[PDB]
Design a protein around this ligand. Structure first.
Ligand SMILES: COc1ccc2c(c1)cc(C(=O)NS(=O)(=O)Cc1ccccc1)n2CC(=O)O
Ligand SMILES: COc1ccc2c(c1)cc(C(=O)NS(=O)(=O)Cc1ccccc1)n2CC(=O)O
Ligand SMILES: COc1ccc2c(c1)cc(C(=O)NS(=O)(=O)Cc1ccccc1)n2CC(=O)O
Lengths: 288, 272
């Protein structure tokens, strides 16, 4: 149990430290909230913090870890945006009491050994060309949940596939934590917040509005059915300069092995130059 | 809201994972230390030595989980002073079927993982589940299935689980035959030959003063003196089942087929 100073930012690197502090806090009555991040915080991460802060008597733990296990690919890992000085400044400004910034050796001292194997959802959509990506993410999430043992854990809905697989993890391994999904924070034109928006030049930043415009078009077109919703989104993506579409798909909300009913999720992934952007929205089909 | 009924000092049986989760949490909060003894199949004396080990921790409450007479076994647990039996159905354990699972590391592909290549995935996935449902302070396994025990310690380390893994020395028949549900099927000639497994290993552990080669050849000799004993492997490893270091502590493992039954044994070895 290292020093805990309430009402300021305590930073721990050692998993044993954050674990002992967390358990200490839980035993004295505070509910522990966890917000997993990979750093490069934007207003989207701040919204997760602010959701966690609203839980009465919460202490909020933000983890910052760029997880080598979920990455490809030669250069993807090294190219990840890292800005930890601006990261800790914002958390201090939001009143966060705990930041957990582990080293790679402390998370993976034996290298990759026991891992989480996701269900078949991890091979679809984002997982199609990146077969071990979601095993890497579910493995780090499980370890975070075990080190921190929060009551609730918060994720954005922007990476909706990820959030769904995380729900499966929690359910399938009987984890005793409530998973809270927070609606995607957007730029004023509709662009979903993402660490990788900084890679759009001014022309690409202009075209990028097409994704959220396509999804909202579809969500309104959907009174007329699935075909009309998809055709609306496709038309908007087509009218946009150098948007290259990787997929546009409408699925049940659990994304599972079941057909679409009245409520669905429309997901899109597109490339602007070298930058791959994702977005998604709730869709109600027909009568609703 | 309400915690399920629990009556201290008696045998309380729950089939619902949420029920045992709630009661275990209530128990931990009033002070007791929760010990978990997982079992499967009909109860044998190896499982009972796990219970007795668990029962000796002061302030413990002992949880025995059971995967498939059932009332005779429950009466044994009652006679051992166990206060909780967790007896879930497959549907309760897998309400969404097989979905997210544990993938063991490369150890699972060696030794027993050769004939049964996904067996350890199943075992680690169900132990992980049992651990999250019960959240024990200590969890108890026999040393008998030593490869399983090592895999579970890796699971606990790699997934940062809070629990102490306690391995309990293997209960043996009076001639040394390691306890196993399979022993009941051996005919007299197989039962007699099966002593060669433990006799080999203990000869090896004593030959070990003369070095690792002497220890291996002693075991191989004892195995070669038994008829009808088809040896699958005889392997000397370090205690974590990596390569045996030139001296220090180790484990010697054997598996063999006698007729239709596969038997396994292992033992601590100290080189030199
Ligand atoms: C509430 O509004 C939003 C909007 C977007 C968000 C978020 C919130 C959060 C993220 C984000 O990147 N989350 S994460 O993948 O880094 C969370 C995470 C961290 C570690 C393991 C698994 C998941 N992102 C997306 C992104 O930065 O690309
Ligand atoms: C339904 O869920 C629970 C959970 C824990 C419970 C009980 C019920 C009952 C007890 C218990 O100890 N009852 S007791 O009369 O033997 C002792 C006792 C009395 C008053 C305060 C604390 C413990 N205990 C604590 C125990 O068995 O050690
Ligand atoms: C202290 O001495 C012993 C001796 C032999 C033992 C045991 C203890 C325990 C077992 C045993 O059968 N363990 S188990 O397969 O029932 C444990 C288990 C339970 C549930 C899921 C996975 C593993 N066995 C037999 C065996 O491992 O095949």
């Amino acid at each position: 149990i290292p020093a805990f100073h309430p009402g300021e930012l305590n930073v721990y690197s050692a998993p044993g430290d954050v674990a002992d502090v967390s358990r200490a806090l839980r035993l004295t009555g505070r509910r522990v909230m966890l917000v997993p991040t990979m750093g490069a915080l934007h207003e989207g991460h701040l919204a997760l913090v602010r959701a966690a802060k609203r839980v009465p008597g919460s202490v909020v733990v933000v983890s910052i870890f760029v997880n080598p296990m979920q990455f490809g690919a030669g250069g993807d890992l090294d190219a990840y945006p890292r800005t930890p000085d601006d990261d800790l400044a914002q958390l201090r400004a939001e009143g966060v009491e705990i930041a957990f910034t582990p080293t790679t050796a402390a998370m993976y001292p034996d290298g990759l050994r026991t891992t989480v194997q996701p269900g078949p959802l991890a091979a679809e959509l984002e997982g199609g060309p990146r077969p071990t990506h979601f095993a890497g993410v579910l493995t780090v999430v499980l370890k975070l949940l075990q080190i921190v043992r929060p009551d609730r854990v918060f994720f954005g809905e922007k990476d909706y596939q990820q959030l769904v697989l995380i729900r499966q993890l929690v359910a399938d391994f009987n984890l005793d934590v409530a998973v809270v999904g927070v609606p995607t924070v957007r730029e004023a034109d509709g662009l979903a917040m993402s660490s990788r928006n900084r890679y759009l030049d001014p022309a690409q930043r202009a075209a990028a509005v097409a994704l959220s415009a396509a999804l909202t078009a579809a969500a309104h077109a959907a009174t007329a059915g699935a075909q009309a919703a998809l055709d609306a989104a496709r038309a908007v993506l087509d009218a946009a300069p150098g948007v290259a579409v990787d997929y546009l798909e409408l699925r049940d909300i659990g994304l599972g092995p079941m057909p679409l009913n009245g409520s669905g999720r429309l997901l899109v992934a597109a490339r602007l130059g070298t930058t791959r952007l994702l977005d998604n929205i709730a869709i109600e089909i027909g009568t609703f």
